[PDB]
Every structure is written in structure tokens, then in C-alpha cells.
Amino acid sequence: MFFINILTLLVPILIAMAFLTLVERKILGYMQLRKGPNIVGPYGILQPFADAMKLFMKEPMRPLTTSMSLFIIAPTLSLTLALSLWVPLPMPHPLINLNLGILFILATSSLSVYSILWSGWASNSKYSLFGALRAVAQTISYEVTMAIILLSVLLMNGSYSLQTLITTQEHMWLLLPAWPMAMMWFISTLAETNRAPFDLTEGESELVGFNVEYAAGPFALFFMAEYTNIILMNALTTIIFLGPLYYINLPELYSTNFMMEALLLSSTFLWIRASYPRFRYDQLMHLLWKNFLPLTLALCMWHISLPIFTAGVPPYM
Amino acid sequence: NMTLNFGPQHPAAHGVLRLVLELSGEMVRKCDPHIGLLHRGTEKLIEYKTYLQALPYFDRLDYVSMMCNEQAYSIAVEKLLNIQPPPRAQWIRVLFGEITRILNHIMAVTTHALDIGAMTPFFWMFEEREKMFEFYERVSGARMHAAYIRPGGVHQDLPLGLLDDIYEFSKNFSLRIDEVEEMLTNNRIWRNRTVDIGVVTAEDALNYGFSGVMLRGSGIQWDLRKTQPYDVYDQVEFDVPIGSRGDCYDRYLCRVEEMRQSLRIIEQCLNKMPPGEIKVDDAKVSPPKRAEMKTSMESLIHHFKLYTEGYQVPPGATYTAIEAPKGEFGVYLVSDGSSRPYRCKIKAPGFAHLAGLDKMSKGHMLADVVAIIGTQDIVFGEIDR
Amino acid sequence: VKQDMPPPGGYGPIDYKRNLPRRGLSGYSMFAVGIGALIFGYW
Amino acid sequence: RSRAEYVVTKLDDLINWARRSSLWPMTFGLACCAVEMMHMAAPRYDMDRFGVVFRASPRQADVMIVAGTLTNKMAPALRKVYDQMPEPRYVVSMGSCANGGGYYHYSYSVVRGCDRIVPVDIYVPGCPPTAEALLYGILQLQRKIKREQKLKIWYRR
Amino acid sequence: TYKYVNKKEQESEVDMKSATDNAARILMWTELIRGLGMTLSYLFREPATINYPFEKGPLSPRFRGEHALRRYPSGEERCIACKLCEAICPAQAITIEAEPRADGSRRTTRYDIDMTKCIYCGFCQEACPVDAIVEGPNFEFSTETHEELLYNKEKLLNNGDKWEAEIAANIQADYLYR
Amino acid sequence: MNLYTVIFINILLSLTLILVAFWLPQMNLYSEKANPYECGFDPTSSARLPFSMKFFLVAITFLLFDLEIALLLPLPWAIQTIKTSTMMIMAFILVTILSLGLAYEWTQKGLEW
Amino acid sequence: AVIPHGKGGRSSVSGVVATVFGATGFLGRYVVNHLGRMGSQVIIPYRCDVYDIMHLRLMGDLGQLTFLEWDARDKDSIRKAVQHSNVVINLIGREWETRNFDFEDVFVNIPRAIAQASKEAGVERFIHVSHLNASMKSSSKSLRSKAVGEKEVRSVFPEAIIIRPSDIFGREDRFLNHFANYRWFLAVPLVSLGFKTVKQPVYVADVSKGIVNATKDPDAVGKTFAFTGPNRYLLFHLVKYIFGMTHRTFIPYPLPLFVYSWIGKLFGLSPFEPWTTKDKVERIHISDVMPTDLPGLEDLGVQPTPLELKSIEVLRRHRTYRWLSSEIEETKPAKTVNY
Amino acid sequence: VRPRSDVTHKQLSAFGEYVAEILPKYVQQVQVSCLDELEICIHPDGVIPTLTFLRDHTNAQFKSLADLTAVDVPTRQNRFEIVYNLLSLRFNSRIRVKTYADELTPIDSIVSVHIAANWYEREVWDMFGVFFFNHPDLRRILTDYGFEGHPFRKDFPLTGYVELRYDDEVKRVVAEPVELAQEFRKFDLNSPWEAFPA
Ligand SMILES: NC(=O)C1=CN([C@@H]2O[C@H](COP(=O)(O)OP(=O)(O)OC[C@H]3O[C@@H](n4cnc5c(N)ncnc54)[C@H](OP(=O)(O)O)[C@@H]3O)[C@@H](O)[C@H]2O)C=CC1
Ligand code: SF4
């Protein structure tokens, strides 16, 4: 039964991963006055499966100058961490409820920065290092504010367990309070998934990036990872800040609304991508260290003070 | 320092540029652009081809502003023949010349964004661009590479429905500029990527021979369309969009204004196009009409000789410059009395601009260079020739 | 005789100037919205 | 149906469908023909609909649409990018400049065709080969990819 | 007549109200939200793409497309080998050699348009006195092998016979203009 | 264990994918197909040579700010501490002193890439 | 015939219309290269899908290379291929007896039918290629079967040249790559510790040029040339040398062949292309025969090219980034054995 | 017949005299075409001096270099005819200063006077072979890296002497002497009858 549950979480998520790609190629399309992929299958539903098969069949290329492990470990790590981080998400009931759940999500995300570092060293191709060193920096920087923003949240939740927020948000979303950080969580979620406004990790016009020397299957796994993440981080926004209504008698309306909010915020980063030009490498770090980190550290203190003098210290457990 | 080709196949270069960089980390210290990847021998081939059979070559030098290019050869050859195009033809060349500057600017503004990372502006305008090519195809038969503007006059009369269709496109086009206007002109992300990047001082721009929006962007007031009015640019009213400071933003804003000013010129041309003939009536210079060559001997002889041998323009040499969308496009045509030219130096607004990349991209990151090439509107056909 | 020409009286007028609309909520009013959310949210 | 032959015919039909449905062309445009495809990528004739999505990294690309003249200075490169593309790979030569020398055939700086440099699968004709015309050529590549029977040949080899 | 773009006419001194409006613009990304609205708007517009095989992008009569050699209604091929179509071809594409046919008429023994050499200028359409060589409407003639693109008299005459009905209609529509 | 079960399936799923990816596809590999890759011309350098990072002082700081965060992480349990006054007095001092570290990072060329 | 006009390069004519049935091969690729360079008309019968023969298209000029669909079991396909050729070159061969084709077929059965038809057609000359040192009694079924063929084809086609090449040295060859690829294997087995099986490699091009020269020379009729090489080698130096250029450790450990023939049997089972072959193994330890015979290279006009000279290009792909820049001069040469 | 204003043919003519007078050490001929274009002709040594006077003279400011080109008249002893076309945004007029240079008698470089010429001078060396002293970095711009011969010279074959193809044997692109499959048909076009006295 546990395996059944393991399958129920991973298989559906992976399929959702696939169709996000399709949805990204139609919502971007209609925004740009074009139908998008509808000719393969009905309305393009078979389109994600089609290139998956093309990608795996095409010859994986191992560059003459390439490590053969820091090359194959990197995608495996990227897919493994991203699919793994869905293990504790408390859609209604979580699967593996962890008392220090949010620290698990923060730690697992942090490990993905290596895959970028390992793939870049493995490729030993310019246009790759230039992509990994800047990339690791972006990801790491957007971790420092990412973590502080969560610590502010937790202090108003009382615990690190993601399951507690379902009881914290039984009367109001944590967006109303703490909206200023939501925005800053959303922008940081955009950086950590290397999506558009912050896609310098792999800029195409700039260093076509970390994936240039990777093809076929090796390419797909990260690929899958990114998109699953795209969902996971959006889902964490939909639990931590937008709290779906929870009724203990019927758990699925929690998951039904979790479904609706996650899809809309997942739709939002798709919409952000088409709408904005990409930021400069230093313009990106200028935002986090200058614009956001002082806001976050100060609002972090406000969230240690709001509890005490408003006699609202949250109940542990 | 490090060296990256940042070269061919990049999605930043047009596909045909080798920009050997000397990146110190991310900052770029020196650029040594290696053009020549699309040198086709355009000017050594023209010497072996008659004046009409060399027109086509001029539609392929800057391949995004075809007709304005072929208005520079047409004006040159016409000068050397002391012949002038008929009144309707001159309006048609000005009508097609501004459709080409809207077409080049949609090319330059949207592809610049494609390089920076904004995807959607390209798709919205490119649909508006095929609407425009249709106008080329409906008047010449080729979507691009028309060959419509002939050394004397233009080749065929406008079909009977084109001016109504150009009104409907021009009527609704400005909202389309307004729409990318909102999506890419105040985005802090665009401004940051474009503002204060590649500033070029006024005297430096004149000294480097920039001569284009690059000249106007830094505040120098020079438009060959008002200063030295070629064709009818003396009977149409427009405002040159001079920018103030020179950052890649002021240059973008100028390019968006010229699209708007060109709609003002296109409006006047549709409102005031004269009834008349589209090609000069000298059979010696412009071919005879299809019915005439099939019923009058003097016309068949003139058709046979013009197509087989040529105009035989009188010996001389001229440098004729017109304001092509990129900048001053000039042809120095040296002519012996023969029907085929002796030399045809195509001055390309672009050979001068690409030279400026090293000076303009000074103290700038790898990413800034992508914007610097984008704001020169460089098409390597014109530079490589 | 019949050649493609502007309609009699000329064509109508075409707009070229930017028509970007300055439509938005005033800044003070805007601040209040977010501030109010926080103020209430905290309570 | 039941026959090791039928299973091997159906499965390539599957393998061929995947390659046919998702052809990722390479972001490599020379001269002007690249514009006449930027029009194919554009809204009147979307290419994505058919599956194709421009991807710069040769390493992640299935079709190389050579657009424009291949000068004798870009030849040594085209071959490199063709050589660095993943194995399943196809070439579409667009433009009379590329399939044959076109205007500029007799130039000293132009290779008279990309067929001299890279093996070419479909030749799309026209000075600016129209954008539908490229789309017909890409669709003709898809007809060529459907006909290929790699698994059948391995079985009866 | 000139026009300043990006030139600030004057120094508006900050007024709290102004400052707030601005600060709000930076803090709550107001202009960024403006941009998102534009793209959401189009998402709701009808896409402009055409089913390519089922629907075709419109081409009017002058479209040059693919070369064809026409024949008189009687059945006598129009070309009389004057060979000025060869003279005016910019790319040297057309190669013509002729000899008096047995009938005694002038005709071309070999007429070879190298389409890869041809840049589809349409001057040949222009130059022909009998208008035997025409730019036919078809643009879809992509070929697997380079040799197929080279065209001899028999392919062009066959191309002419296949598309004669539309070629005649197209020339019918545009001849007054020429 | 329950976590161990999930994780090994997670690695298995990824290792399964990569394996298929390398053995199913057919492969033919002349050099120049595997050679390094820099836009179509020879690299013209080692592609691993010393690469300068203009972000010299930003990098060092991140590490210091990370640690502060660390110290800021125990807060959730420390909120319930009976003292409260000392808690906040401590936490506010930590956040303020690090932020000043940042302040000096800004003031100095650090964080100015 | 076709009078030879031109300057000598592509777009010129040499007048050799030649069916070449196994062109897709490693040797083949080279044969079509020169034939195409010279300007000869080359008909390439092929069975593999068009995708795989694309590599042959750019070779040769337009209308100079013609590809025909052909099946070995179907006699009619061979019939039409040689219809209009005047030179037929046979390079049909394999190392792994495939499910539907036996060594006899690939070497003796098929290459007969082919020359047989060629005669019916009236082709001026047929060149048949069989492995060097091929006794009708040689251990490897392959070599013996090949020997069987060179006899037969002489009765189907008299005065048919029979070049008999040694194992070939070239990029994409086995002789050199096989050993270099033993890297995957931690230890590199070598029967008799790689001794007493002196081997003389021959560059592929030399072989190709030789073959081509045959097509255009009256001196070769019924000749059984033997392209051999510029220097012989005990398998030991060869193996190490290879590993030397590859810059990978060399660990020669002797392996009793009786057991090793078994290892060949193992890989030999591969459904897909077999890595090694029982018939291979024997061949590898089958000593190169001495050079007393109608000479090949030089005799046919090409001076052999030493192995060390081009080895760097063949073995480069097997090196690691660390050694990629390393050059031949840095490395040492192997030693020959006039024995 | 084109409309011609003699105002210009008079203005430009006068200026020509003015330049000539001011720079008599180098100006050999100064003509105005029937197309109202001035074309001071200077001894090659006057390259630096004549340009500088035009770039920096209050009564003749010629700030930008429109183009630098070299026609090649093989008959002429001095084969090349370097032509510099300049523009004066202040006086809205263009002038052309043309000098003569033989193959191995180099001209001075004006990169100092106008930096626009940095590239065009490299273009003239690559195509015609004229050499420019004191040039910062003269090196082929348009031709291939290993190209031998200067292409726009009238004595260079159009098709050239080398063409490129990929050779499998050597797995690398390889030059070969040009072999063309349809030579450029050299139509003779000049008519045996003249047009006017000119
Ligand atoms: N080291 C060497 O290479 C040596 C080779 N030789 C001889 O030279 C010849 C060429 O060798 P090489 O090129 O390496 O051989 P390959 O393994 O490269 O194959 C040669 C060609 O034969 C074709 N072929 C093989 N089996 C069949 C079949 N059953 N039906 C139809 N065609 C077939 C193959 O076509 P496809 O792949 O399409 O099936 C291939 O193109 C061989 O015959 C061999 O006996 C002699 C001495 C040394
Ligand atoms: S083919 Fe016609 S269009 Fe395509 S590049 Fe050559 S010239 Fe430009």
C-alpha cells in the first residue's frame, strides 16, 4: 500500500511534468497570436510524449573532454532531488510527515546547485563554465533570501512542519499577512527554477548554457527536473502563503483548491516568461543583495516582534 | 583574459558573425569582430553584370530593407543617365521606402528583444510583417527580394487594390506599435538592460562615420531624407526623431518613433499619389510596354537591345546616398560608357557601426555586447557584401 | 483611366502617435490596500 | 497480428513517429533565408504547431536548415556544427544560395552548394524560398522520416 | 522638423504625492503588472496561424514561384529560341542551344533552367517576346536530390502543361498592368 | 524506512532513465562530433583556464549571511522561551550586526561586482 | 568508353562507371572517395536505409553517384546494378556470421553471383577483395571461406583481379580501434602474451588508392595483388603502442586461446553488432604471411604509409582531455620484426 | 531629363578653387561633375594634409568619412584610384578626394584623421592590395583566413582559383583548384556603335 502511494505521488507528478511543457507551449502561443502545438494527437495532448521518445532515442553524446560521472550524476541528482521534494508536501495529508519538513525542502533544494556545478565542470567547455559559475551564484544567492523569507513564515506558524500551516491558515491565507514576502517568495521561486525573468543560468542569447554539451537523455532528466520543480515551488507557495480551505470531513476540497491555486501560480511564471525580458547577471544579484535582502532581514525582525508584543507567540505543535 | 568566439551559430549574432571576445570573467575588455563569413563577392560580380541584371544584387545586401536598398541603385543609375522617374513612381518609391523602414524597425526592435530575452514582441509584429510583405508580393510577386524599384522608374503599376489595403494596415498598425510600446519600453528590466549601455558621444559618432539612428540617437540632427531630399521627400512632412543621450534606450525609442513617423509619411503618400506612368517614357532607359513591343518595330528593337545588351549609361561616377532604415546607404557607381558597370562600392550603414562595437562596448559585460550589436541593427549582408 | 489611386477626397486620417494609456490606481490609495491587508492580517 | 516482422514494422512506425513529430531545428540562419523562416516561426505559419522548436545548441537539435550562402569562410564551421549535432540528424538546404550557389554561384568566396559541405536531405527552392515553401520542405522531411525503416533492416540483416 | 525622444523638458521637484507614486511603482512593481495585462489580453485574441496543408497563405497573380514553358493553344511550344531570356538572366541559370527543327521552324534543342542557380527574379518572365517562359504559381517543388532541381525542356514543358490553366488565368489578370 | 523506501525508488527512477538513454540510442562518433564546442570555430583556449569572478566580496558575504540565518533558524523553538525579552534582544542584535556587515559590503567595492 | 576530359578534380570526367556493392563499408567509404574525386561514374548498390549512405553523397559530384536498392538473395537486384557499369568492385564482407547470412554467403556465395552477372553484362573488369593469408585450410572459417571464393569467382569471371588486403589500418578500422578499445576491459588479454603473430598493417587509403588504380590500369588482369604495409610488428608493440598513443595503461596478460576462443564465442552471441568473434580471435592471432607475391602497393602505384604516421588520428578519440593535446613526437614508436 | 540647379555647380566649383588655393602643394585637379559633385584630386602625399584641412577648417568642416574605395584601372600606371567621399553635416555638402596608388607604393592611412577608415582601409588592402602605412591593425577583413590573392583586382578571376568541399578520407574541408560545372558564360555586350561625342 505504501508503494501504491509512492506510485500515486510520483507517477502523477511526472505526467503533470510532461503536460506542463505542453501547456507552456500553448499559453505562450496564444499570448503571441499563435495556436501552439495542436497537430500531433488531439489538441497537442500527445505532444509531450512525442519529443520524450525523440530525446531518448537520439544519441547521447559524451564530449571527448568530459567526465563520465560528474556528467551522468548531474541529471540523476536533478530529477532525484526534485521528485524527492514532493515526498513531504502536505497536499491534504502528506505522504511522509516530517516534523522538520520545511528544512527538508530547503536542504533538498540547496543540493540541486551542485548538479549545475558538476555538469559545468564535466563539460569543460567554455559557454559552460561561464554558465555554471554564474549559475551557481544565482541559485545560491537566491537561497539566502529564500531561506530568511521562510524563517519569517515559520515564526508565525510555530513549527517547521508543513502540516501545521493547514491549521494556521484555517481562517485567512498567509498572503494577507506577509504579502510583502510572498512577492519576494514568488520572485525567488522564479530565480531558483531558472525560469525567465531570471534565466541567466542558461541564457540562450547569452551562452546558448549549462546544457550546451548535453544531449538526448542526459538532457531530458534535468529537463524533467526543472519542470517538476516549477510545479513544486509553486505548490509550496500554494501551501505556505495561499492556504487552500481545509475541511477535516472531506480532505479533497483541500487538494481540489490546492490543484486550482497551484495551476494558476504555475500559469503565472509561464505568463511572466513571455511578458518580461531577462535581467542582467549583476542586475539579478543587485536585486537580491541590495533590493530584497535588506527588506527580508528587517521584515524578518518584524516577524520576531509581531508575535511577542501582539502576545501572539504561535503554539508549538 | 579569456577568449570566446561568441561566434557563428550563436542566437545573438545573425548566424554569420565571429566576435572574438577578450572576456575577463564576465566583463568584456576587448572585441575583435571577425566578419567576412558572408562575403559573397557582390561587388565583383556586379562588374560582370548589366545595370538591370545587377539590380537584384542590391536587394540582398541588407536583406531586411530590400526596396530602400534598390532605391539607392535606382537613384544612382538615374543620375548617371540624367533621367528622372515619372511623378507616380517617385511617390510609389517613397510609399514602399517607408513600408521598408517599418519592416526594418520591426525587425530591429523585436530581434533585439529576442536577444535580450523578450519573446512575445517578435511574434506580434512578425504577423504584422507578413501583412506587409504581402504588399511587396502583390506589387512585384516576391514576398521579399522584389526587384520592383527599377533603375529608371519602378517596374509595374500598383495593382488596383493595394492602396486601400495599405490604408487598412496603416490604420491599425499604430496600436500594434503601442502594444510592444507598453510591453518593452518601461519594463524596468528593459530599461536596465538598455539604458546607459553603449553611450556614444556626438563628435565620436561623426568621427566613426556612424551616420544613422546611431548619429541621431546622441542628438546630432542629420536625416538624408530632409537634409538632401532624394525622390519626393521634399513634398512629404515628417519629424526626425532625434534622441538626446545615446544609450541603447534612446536609440530604441528613436526607432519606435521612426516607425510612427513613417506611418505619417505613408498616410501622405496614399492621400496624395498622382495619376500617371510608373516608369520614364524613354525606351532607351526603361523597357517598352508589352503591347507596344508586340505591335511596333521601334519598340521590339528597344526591348531586344535593352534586355540583351543594356542602357549603356554615359561615362561618369557618382556617390548617391539615401536614408536606408539602418543608416546612410550609398552606391559609388563608376561607369564607363559600357552597359555594365565598372565599380559599385556599396557603402553599408553597418561596416562603420560594427567598427564602433569595440569603442561602444567599453567596460561592459558579455550580456551588454548582445545589446550593443542589437542596437546597431547590423545585417551582415550589408557589412560583408 | 483606371489606375490604383487615392479615393476621391482623400483617405481618412491615420493615428501614428503613441496612445499608451496612463491608467492606474493612485499611489497613496495603492499603499493603503497592501498596508490594510497586513494590518488586518496581523490582527 | 502475430509475426516478429509485424512487431518490428509497428515499433519503427513508433520510433519514426517520435522523430517525425518532434523535429527540433537548429538556430542557424545565414543570409536572408533565415528571415523567411523567422516568418515560419512567426504567427501566420507557426512551426511549433508541427512540433519544431528552435534550439540553438547543436547538441540538442535534429534538423539543420542551412539558409543563405555558405561562403568559404563559414564552410569550415557549418561542417563543425553538423558534425557536432547528435546522430539522428537531418539537413534541409534552403535557398538557391545554399542548394547550389544561386546568385553568387560563380563567386570566389561562395561554396557552390552546402551539399559539397554537409549531406543534404531536402532542397527547398526559391531566392527567398517562401515560408510555406519551407514548411512544405519540413513536411517533406517528415514524409522522408516516416518511410525510413531502420528496425526492419536490422531484423533482416 | 525634429522631435526629442527621451528628453525631459523640466525638473519636476519631488512632491510627497509624487514620491509615493514613484516609490509604489518600484516597491509593488506596478509597471511590470501593466506588461502582464497586455499578454493576458492577446491570450484571449484569435490566433492568426493557418492550417498549412489545409489552408494556404494567399499569393496574388504576379507571384513568381516555379518556372514553366508555355505552349500555343494549337500545341506548338511558344519558345522560338531568341535566347534573350538567357541574355537577361542575372544568375546565368538558363542555358539554351537551338537548331532549325525539321518543320523548318526555330525551336530550342535544349532549354535548361538551373533552379538552384536561379534567384527567381522574374526578368525572364519580363524579357520573353512570345512570353514562352513564365513564372508559374507553384512554390512547392522541394526535391530530395540536387539533380531533380536542375530542369531540362521536358520538365519545364511538363510543368507548363500541368499549370497552364492557372498560368493563363494569372497572365490574363496581370497583362494590362504590364 | 518509509523515507528510505521512497528515496531509493527516486534514485532508481532516475538511474533507470539515464541507463536507457545511453544504451537504446545508436551511436557513431567521429571526433569533431565529440570535440569541445565554442560556436563552430576551434575553442582557441583550454575552456577550463582561470576565469575571473568580479563578485569577489559578494561571495564571501553570502557565506557569512548564511551562517547568520543559521543562527536565525532556531527561532521558532526560541519563540516559546519564557524569557522573550532576551530572545528578541538577542535575535534583533544578530540580524542588525549582520546587516551592518552587509552595509559595509555595499560601502566597500564588494557587492558592486 | 568515356574519353577522359577535365583537369582532374571533381566536376571532371575519368570514364570509369563502376558498381561497388559493399560501399557502405570502412574500406568502401574510401573506395568511393577516390573514385568520386577522380570523377568516375560510381553506382553504389545499397541495402541499408538511405539515412546511412548519406555520408557518400557529398563524395562524388552530381549525377556521378547513383544509389541502387539491392538484396543479396535476390539475383535480379545484382542484374540491374551491373546493367550499365563497365567496372565491378566487390567488397562484401563481415566478421560476424549473421542469422541470415553465413560466412560463405558474404564471402563466397554472394561474391560469385555478383561477378557472374557482371560477365553476362559484359563489364570489362571485376575486382574481388579477399582477406590476406587465406588458405582453403586456414583455421578461421572466415579466411578459409574467402579462399573458397577467390577460386570460384575465377570460373564465373576469368582474369578477374583479386586484391587480397591484410587487416587494414585506418580511422574507423577494427585492427587499430579494437585493441585501443580494450581499455574498457581492465586487462587486455593477448594470446601468447601478444607474441608470435607478427602483423603488417596497411593504411586504408593506400588500399583504396591501390584498388582504384587497378580499375584504371591494363597491367592488372588475373593479378592477385597483396597490399601489405610499410613495416611489420609483433602484436606486442602494436598493442602497447596503441595504448601508448591512447595514453592508457598497458597490461599484457597472456590468455590461453582455447579459453579465449570461448570468450569470442561469448560476445559472438550479441544480437547487435558483435564486439569480437571466435573467427576474429583466430584471425587476430593468425600470423601475417610473408611478402612473396604479386606486389600490391607501390606495384600498383601507391607507396605504403607507415602506421605511426597516421596512428595519431585513428587513436585520438580514445584519449582523455589530459592527453588530447599530446602529439606523436612525445610518444614512442613500436618495433618491427622482419621475422 | 533630370532637373539641374546651377546654384550648386557654382557653389561647389568655388569651393573647389578655395580648397585648391589653400592646399596647392597637393591638389592636382579639382572638378565638378555634371551631377554637381566635387572631386578634388590630390597627390598621394597629400592624403593626410588635405583630409585634415577638410575635417578641421571652419569654412569647410567635413566631419564624417562616407566611404574609402579603390577603383582599379589596370591601364593606369598607378593601378588603384583611392577615392575618399566625405560629408559635411554643417554645410550639407559632400566632396570626394581621390588619389592614385600603385600596387607596391603604399598610401598613408587616415585612421588618425577619421577613425571610420580603420575598417575601410583594411577592406581596400584585402580586396585590392594597396597598403596603408601607420595603420593600427591592417589585416584581411572580408576574405577567408588563408585566401591568397586580392579579389577585386580586375586581373583576378571571378570564380577564383580555389573552392572548398568536405573530403571523407581526411574528414576535413579541403581546397582544390576550382573546377566549375558550367563556366560563367561571358556574353560580349558592347555594341559597335557609339552614342554621342562624349
Ligand atoms: N580489416 C579489414 O577491413 C579487411 C577487410 N578485408 C575485406 O575487405 C572487404 C571490405 O571490408 P570492410 O569494409 O571492413 O567490411 P564492412 O564490415 O565495412 O562491410 C563492407 C560492406 O559489405 C556489405 N555487406 C556485408 N554483408 C552483406 C550482405 N549479407 N548483403 C549485402 N551486403 C553486405 C555492408 O553493407 P551493409 O553494412 O549495408 O550491410 C558493407 O557496406 C571485406 O569483404 C573484407 O573481406 C580484407 C582484409 C582486411
Ligand atoms: S537564396 Fe536568394 S534569398 Fe536565400 S540567400 Fe541566397 S539570395 Fe538571399
Ligand code: SF4
Ligand atoms: S525568351 Fe521566351 S522565347 Fe525567347 S527563348 Fe527565352 S523563352 Fe524561348
